[PDB]
């Protein structure tokens, strides 16, 4: 149905020294398609999905230059932010950038964003209207004043409603085999006794795409808010995703409990109960 | 595609 393109950026000052670690990655949906790493050999934007390889030399030169440019902006940033927060040069610091766009099921523009962090707390973020800024603290208000006079939002809105959206469609059409696929979750349930009167039922969902899934437990047709362990959705490393959800059950009453799986690759929601 | 505008020093 609805899609997204997203670019992620990390610069770490390694200092008393300098020369920062820069890594950039691009995703379409839950699939990585490009990367840059300053540590890596090539100093180029590199393909990380089959469908991006068909792009020409113009694209790779254009992305390399634009990614190299992001990096050197962030290097000046690291110098500047030390000054704005009176931090010394002995310690390591981190900037982070995220931008991208969402589209709906018709592939029309839904929402854009451009956010920025320093030392893992929010610094400055573009508001949903794409014409104004939320600045977190007082140093970020100085950045907000710079960016207001420089028309950064105007430029960002042009990218986020045009170029982001128009390239997302192109990526979705060139790799429609990969990107417009939905791997349904493959589900099972295991049973483990912890004592002589209690037992753990663990409901599994394996090899699904996209990563968005909802696992819920129900005792006699009613949502189990209580004793529910529920892990972080983890990757398999082949492109697909895994997740479980577990509950503790007083023994011999295991058949009272139902596991409910909703994911968009499924024709109907799934109901596993143990047996 | 990456942004070729709108990316400015803080």
């Amino acid at each position, epitope marked *: 149905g609805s899609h997204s393109m997203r670019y992620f950026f990390t610069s770490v000052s390694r200092p008393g020294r300098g020369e920062p670690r820069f890594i950039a990655v691009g995703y379409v949906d839950d699939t990585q398609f490009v990367r840059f790493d300053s540590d890596a050999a090539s100093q180029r934007m590199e393909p990380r999905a089959p469908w991006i390889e068909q792009e020409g030399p113009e694209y790779w030169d254009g992305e390399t230059r634009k990614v190299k440019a992001h990096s050197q902006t962030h290097r000046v940033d690291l110098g500047t932010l030390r000054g704005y927060y009176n931090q010394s040069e002995a310690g390591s610091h981190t900037v982070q950038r995220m931008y991208g766009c969402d589209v709906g099921s018709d592939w029309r523009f839904l929402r854009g964003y451009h956010q920025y962090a320093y030392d893992g707390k929010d610094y400055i973020a573009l508001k949903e209207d794409l014409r104004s800024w939320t600045a977190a603290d007082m140093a970020a208000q100085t950045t907000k004043h710079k960016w207001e006079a420089a028309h950064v939002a105007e430029q960002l809105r*042009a990218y986020l409603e045009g170029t982001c959206v128009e390239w997302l469609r192109r990526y979705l059409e060139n790799g429609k085999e990969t990107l417009q696929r939905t791997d349904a979750p493959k589900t099972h349930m295991t049973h483990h006794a912890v004592s002589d009167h209690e037992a753990t039922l663990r409901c599994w969902a394996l090899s699904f795409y996209p990563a968005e899934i909802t696992l819920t437990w129900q005792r006699d047709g009613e949502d189990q808010t209580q004793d529910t362990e529920l892990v972080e959705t983890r990757p398999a490393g082949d492109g697909t995703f895994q997740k479980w959800a577990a509950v503790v059950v007083p023994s011999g009453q295991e058949q009272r409990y139902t596991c409910h799986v909703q994911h968009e690759g499924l024709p109907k929601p799934l109901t596993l109960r143990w047996e | 595609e990456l942004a070729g505008i709108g990316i400015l020093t803080v």
Partner: T-cell receptor
Amino acid sequence: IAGITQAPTSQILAAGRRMTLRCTQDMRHNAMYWYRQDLGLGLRLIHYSNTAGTTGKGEVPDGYSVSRANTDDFPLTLASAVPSQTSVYFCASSLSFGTEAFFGQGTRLTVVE
Amino acid sequence: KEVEQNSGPLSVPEGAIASLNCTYSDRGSQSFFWYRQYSGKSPELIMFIYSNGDKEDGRFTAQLNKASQYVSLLIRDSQPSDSATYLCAVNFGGGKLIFGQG
């Protein structure tokens, strides 16, 4: 009033000499550029620089050196003076990469043998 | 790479509409610029355009068609002071800001 100046405005070089064209900018701009303009084929990018400290190569960097020690200065220097480098030279700058460029005065340069 | 302009010299009489086009080779170019340059002078900016479609400034209309790789400048009502070589500038990367032939 913040601007961009080039120096000198005109120069006659002997063949095999060295010449540095200065270009400075008050406007706190990150990105700076060097161009050559010739009678048939328009402006032509020699070198660029996206931020202070960093540089880059354009369409025709051959014969041309460049340096970015500070935000303000972007001097173009020519190591060997070939007769092919007779042009009008334009320094420029923009607030960040991909934005509107503001040009210097220009420099008429003629290398004679 | 290539930025090709509408091949001059054009000759448009007074009070009329002059029209210059610009084509570029990079599908992913995101910023586009029109400069005016008098005889032995610096280029100075007429307009920038980022988004697809029409931009208005006085006697000047910018038009951008990114799918067609097309920028144009329509000069309405042209004065004798509009006589200059007109320059188109397309940005190809970070600092790869590349120009037409004029």
